[PDB]
């Protein structure tokens with residue numbers, strides 16, 4: 001029993017984190033085989049042209065430190081918004097890995113790092129506006145987000161910068177930004193967010209599985225009539241695919257998805273009136289159906 005914001009064990013990723021120093025900038029890099037990946041804005045600099053700036057760089061400008069052993073850069077290249085530093089040593093601790101891009105609403109673990117040394121791990125969700133509400137201080141650029149499947153690390157996020165509202169923006173590991181953001185000094189701001197409906201529903205199911213049932217009712221809505229109240233409260237539309245994905249949770253609790261939707265509709269119209277769900281007085285939207293199954297069945 002119990003439900004917590006659970007990150008993946010971080011050990012496979014800890015052994016890939018290095019410090020990259022160039023100019024007066026120090027940030028974090030991801031060392032896999034003989035390549036170190038880091039944000040390109042580490043390059044020594046109003047509206048930088050990074051292809052130009054990278055031409056003016058030499059391999060010896062980049063200081064890479066794995067713990068205490070220093071790594072010598074033998075080549076360098078740009079890959080969209082990340083820099084790839086070729087080094088003369090393949091990382092003996094390179095895990096089985098792949099680079100995947102995630103979808104808004106999906107979750108990952110974040111290994112917050114400073115000067116190449118890991119400092120903490122937490123669970124994040126890609127917000128529908130392609131930001132993440134992380135916890136990041138100066139020096140944390142290059143910290144990575146990841147999921148683990150069996151023994152394979154799926155890297156999905158490299159941190160690049162904090163937006164004025166205090167939320168965070170980064171790239172996938174091929175250097176492509178999540179959302180309409182750029183690694184140059186703009187007045188760019190996060191766009192309006194919405195609540196991930198399918199996640200709230202999965203968390204309602206987690207609550208039922210854990211004995212919280214005070215919000216249940218006998219009523220059942222239809223997809224169309226639920227999506228109309230969703231729109232009013234700034235909730236993402238719910239699709240038939242979402243209902244199918246919720247099927248296993250439906251089965252295990254014996255509550256149909258559209259039944260649980262009627263209860264969600266009630267929680268939006270009325271409040272909770274001083275009650276809580278899973279220790280929360282808010283509707284929680286950063287647990288996917290997959291995370292619930294993992295924590296409420298097999299981990």
Ligand SMILES: O=c1c(O)c(-c2ccc(O)c(O)c2)oc2cc(O)cc(O)c12
Nearest residue numbers: 045161162163164184185186187188189
């Ligand atoms: O976080 C940000 C940041 O660091 C800087 C920046 C740019 C050039 C520099 O030479 C520098 O030292 C800092 O630009 C930004 C521009 C944005 O639109 C949003 C941001 O969040 C940042």
